[PDB]
From a paper:
Human SMG1 is one of the largest PIKK family members (~410 kDa) and plays a crucial role in nonsense-mediated mRNA decay (NMD), a conserved pathway that regulates mRNA stability in the cytoplasm of eukaryotic cells. In metazoans, SMG1 forms a stable complex with two additional proteins, SMG8 and SMG9, and specifically phosphorylates the RNA helicase UPF1. SMG1 phosphorylates UPF1 specifically at Ser/Thr - Gln (SQ) motifs present in the unstructured N- and C-terminal regions that flank the helicase core. Briefly, SMG1 consists of an N-terminal solenoid 'arch' and a compact C-terminal 'head' region.
For structure determination, we incubated SMG1-8-9 with UPF1-LSQ and AMPPNP, a non-hydrolyzable ATP analogue, and subjected the sample to cryo-EM single particle analysis. The final reconstruction reached an overall resolution of 2.9 Å, and allowed us to further complete and refine the published model for SMG1-8-9. Importantly, compared to the previously published apo-SMG1-8-9 structure, the current reconstruction revealed extra density in the kinase active site accounting for both AMPPNP and UPF1-LSQ. The active site of SMG1 shows excellent density for residues 1075–1081 of UPF1-LSQ. The hydroxyl group of Ser1078, the phospho-acceptor residue in UPF1-LSQ, is positioned by residues of the catalytic loop, in particular Asp2335 and His2337. In our structure, the glutamine at position +1 of UPF1-LSQ reaches into a hydrophobic cage formed by the SMG1 activation segment and FATC domain. In particular, UPF1 Gln1079 stacks against Tyr3654 and Leu2365 and forms hydrogen bonds with the backbone of Val2367. In our model, the Leu residue at position −1 in the substrate forms a C-H⋅⋅⋅π-interaction with SMG1 Phe2215 and is further stabilized by hydrophobic interactions with SMG1 Pro2249 and Gly3656. The local resolution of around 3 Å allowed us to model SMG9-bound ATP in the reconstructed density, revealing the molecular basis for how the adenosine nucleotide is recognized by this unusual G-fold domain. In this manuscript, we report the first structure of a substrate-bound PIKK active site, thereby revealing the basis for phosphorylation site selection by SMG1 and other PIKK family members.
Numbering used by the authors:
A (entry chain B): 4 to 13, 39 to 81, 133 to 172, 181 to 275, 295 to 360, 408 to 458, 476 to 485, 488 to 511, ...
B (entry chain C): 170 to 285, 293 to 343, 361 to 435, 452 to 519
The structure:
């Protein structure tokens, strides 16, 4: 339970141990018990993350020897503990700067996600409701196209490392596996029917969008073909601890998660790996079970990362800014093709504000104002 | 000899599932003015249909089989599907129009489209805007239902919807409804957080999301003063539906479902009714205006301009 940057720096007791990493991400709700911490505390069987405990992103890690598994947790604006801080600050310390603020945060979390998609064997996304946000079909689509553009800059670093042959080629130990966790939230055995339904949905969606293919190399992640990859956490009295107490008071006066994850961790600890290819002519997927030091050797070099700035400054608020700019521009014509002078000035200004507007109206407005003031 | 026109027992349709106008409602509209319209926006299982019914012509003691806006069935949940397609129409005795809609960015709709111009994903993402704009144009109040708090994607979708609408401009009111709330959500500490986040997230939206529908003055928080909040946005919470010392019930930490539903209904029927266009309309001219608005939204330009960018 320590930050990532505060760990890579500094092992001998377990400097050599075959392990499996597990990345955790997704959205959360404004509550006291995050849907991520409880997960770890539930698998390990111990209270790892205790109760009552510029940038708005973060990463955390925790290694378990009793199981030989490393856990990595991501945190960004998608959550609420961070979004609250962002808004709280923004409240104390313009429709042109805030847009850039949110855009920057989005870019930051995007690269922080690419990181996990490169140094992880298994990774899962959590959600507070059964229905899954279809918008993901786009995020992933806009993520692969990025790693490729910046793939050389990565392999050119771990190059002088013990990563291996395939690892040094794809900058990944093996095509990661994706898992889904959904919270019931009072809805509704039928659970199995719902699980299979969601699986079929996700499969068809990611397939038509081409986020998934027959080859397990070009893809940035893959799903199973015979096993289950969708878990639904039912209700539980643990949440809202106070409530639980009250319940107890009223008395003094009168498969499984771990089993759902081990079926996937065993295939890696045993060196077998994952083989997902149904193209009628499947191909073999690389694999590598590294050690602690052998893993940090590359994790540190990747975390310390130069052209990523220019590579990410092109990749969604981009479409919004584009639409706003195009609108203001196309409208500038009617603003200049209309015109003491205050009369015509205000007239053209009103015609412009009524013809189109967006997130960059200040610039296109000051421009027309200056032009008018200069044309007389 | 001054009887009324006719009473409706079930809702009707206004837009076919394939986005096609349906002229089968004039039979219930009059030449009267000063009408009020209401709309809704939400995801798959937020509880839109179950809300409008209880707000227009239904009570919690009734059964889901008598709702004027059909709800979801057990056989529909275990399969991850929807039950509301297109747009519905209903009008009560008080002469108040209610409009139900289909979820936005629904996976079931896309799944169905699979078995049937570039990618269907963009098409489904467009329909949502095509509907949101029309609602923001022909409605006085627009309710937003949610299952959990701070999705962060809805606030972006809304802002992007008010930039592709048809066209001293009109902006309707907005209500933030939180369905399936719990005890933890009925705390002042979290209440101020909610209001704070909503205010800092919709500061440049141009929509009327504040200065109305104050649940603080409706007896939901008896001993709480308005000074506790810096800016009370129009937000409402709806919870889950349901010798002497031994029979005492448990501590839930919030008011009953009936009470909140009644208060919300009373506050919704009292919303403003300003003019939409540059003329005073009746219950018929509005219908024609809306039809023209739809026909325009379809053959629009801004929507195509946004579609090409994807
Ligand atoms: N407050 C609530 N308490 C308990 N159950 C609720 C509550 N609100 C909604 N539900 C249940 O959840 C479902 C809500 O879906 P409903 O049919 O009301 O509309 P919807 O799902 O928003 O619309 P659509 O699915 O067509 O997009 C129903 O099965 C209803 O019984
Ligand atoms: Mg419905």
């Amino acid at each position: 339970p320590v930050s990532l940057r505060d760990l890579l720096m500094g092992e001998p007791p377990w400097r050599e141990d075959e392990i499996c990493v597990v990345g955790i991400f997704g959205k959360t709700a404004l509550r006291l018990n995050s849907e991520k911490f409880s997960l770890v505390n539930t698998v390990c069987d111990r209270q790892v993350f205790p109760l009552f405990r510029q940038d708005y992103s973060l990463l955390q890690a925790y290694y378990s020897q009793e199981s030989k598994v490393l856990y990595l947790l991501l945190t960004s604006i998608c959550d609420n503990s961070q979004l609250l801080r962002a808004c709280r600050a923004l409240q104390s310390g313009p429709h042109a700067e805030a847009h850039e603020f949110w855009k920057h945060q989005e870019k930051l979390q995007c690269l922080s996600l690419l990181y996990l998609f490169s140094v992880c064997h298994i990774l899962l996304l959590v959600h507070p409701t059964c229905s899954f946000d279809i918008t993901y079909d786009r995020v992933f689509r806009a993520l692969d196209g990025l790693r490729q553009k910046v793939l050389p800059l990565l392999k050119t670093a771990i190059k002088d490392c013990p990563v291996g042959k395939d690892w040094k080629l794809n900058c990944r130990p093996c095509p990661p596996r994706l898992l889904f966790l959904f919270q019931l939230n009072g809805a509704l055995s039928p659970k199995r029917r719902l699980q299979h339904a969601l699986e079929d949905q996700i499969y068809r969606i990611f397939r038509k969008s081409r986020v998934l293919t027959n080859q397990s190399i070009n893809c940035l992640f893959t799903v199973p073909a015979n096993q289950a990859f969708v878990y639904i956490v039912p209700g539980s009295q643990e949440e809202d601890p106070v409530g639980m107490l009250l319940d107890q008071l009223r008395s003094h006066c009168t498969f499984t998660l771990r089993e759902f994850l081990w079926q996937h961790v065993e295939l890696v600890l045993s060196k077998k790996g994952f083989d997902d290819s149904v193209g009628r002519n499947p191909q073999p997927s690389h694999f590598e079970l590294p050690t602690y030091q052998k893993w940090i050797s590359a994790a540190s070099k990747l975390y310390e990362v130069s052209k990523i700035l220019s590579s990410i400054k092109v990749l969604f608020l981009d479409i919004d800014t584009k639409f706003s700019e195009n609108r203001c521009q196309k409208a500038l014509p009617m603003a200049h093709s209309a015109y003491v002078h205050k009369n015509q000035l205000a007239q053209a200004l009103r015609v412009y504000s009524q013809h189109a507007r967006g997130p960059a109206f200040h610039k296109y407005a000051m421009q027309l104002h200056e032009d008018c003031y200069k044309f007389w | 000899k001054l009887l009324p026109p006719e009473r409706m027992k079930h809702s009707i349709k206004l837009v076919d599932d394939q986005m096609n106008w349906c002229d089968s409602a004039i039979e219930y509209l009059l030449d009267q003015t000063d009408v009020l319209v209401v709309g809704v926006l939400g995801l798959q299982g937020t509880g839109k249909s179950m809300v409008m019914s209880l707000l227009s012509a239904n009570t919690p003691e009734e059964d889901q089989r008598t709702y004027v806006f059909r709800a979801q069935s057990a056989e529909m949940k275990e399969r991850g599907g929807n039950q509301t397609s297109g747009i519905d129409f209903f009008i009560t005795q008080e002469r108040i129009v209610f409009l139900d809609t289909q979820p936005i960015l629904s996976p079931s709709i896309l799944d169905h489209l699979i078995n049937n111009y570039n990618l269907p994903h963009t098409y489904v993402e467009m329909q949502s805007l095509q509907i949101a704009a029309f609602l923001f144009t022909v409605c006085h109040v627009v309710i937003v239902v949610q299952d959990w708090f701070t999705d962060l994607s809805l606030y972006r979708f809304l802002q992007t919807a008010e930039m592709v609408k048809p066209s001293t401009e009109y902006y309707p009111h907005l209500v933030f409804l939180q369905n399936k709330a719990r005890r933890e959500d009925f705390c002042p500490r979290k209440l101020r957080q909610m209001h704070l986040m909503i205010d800092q997230l919709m500061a440049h939206s141009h929509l009327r999301y504040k200065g109305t529908l104050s649940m603080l003055q409706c007896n939901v928080f008896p001993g709480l003063p308005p000074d506790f909040l810096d800016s009370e946005v129009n937000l409402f919470l709806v919870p889950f539906m349901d010798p002497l010392f031994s029979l005492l019930p448990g501590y839930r930490g919030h008011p009953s479902f009936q009470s909140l539903v009644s208060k919300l209904r009373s506050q919704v029927m009292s919303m403003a009714r300003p003019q939409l266009s540059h003329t005073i309309l009746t219950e018929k001219n509005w219908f024609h205006y809306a039809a023209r608005i739809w026909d325009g939204v379809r053959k629009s330009s801004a929507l195509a301009e946004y579609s090409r960018l994807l």
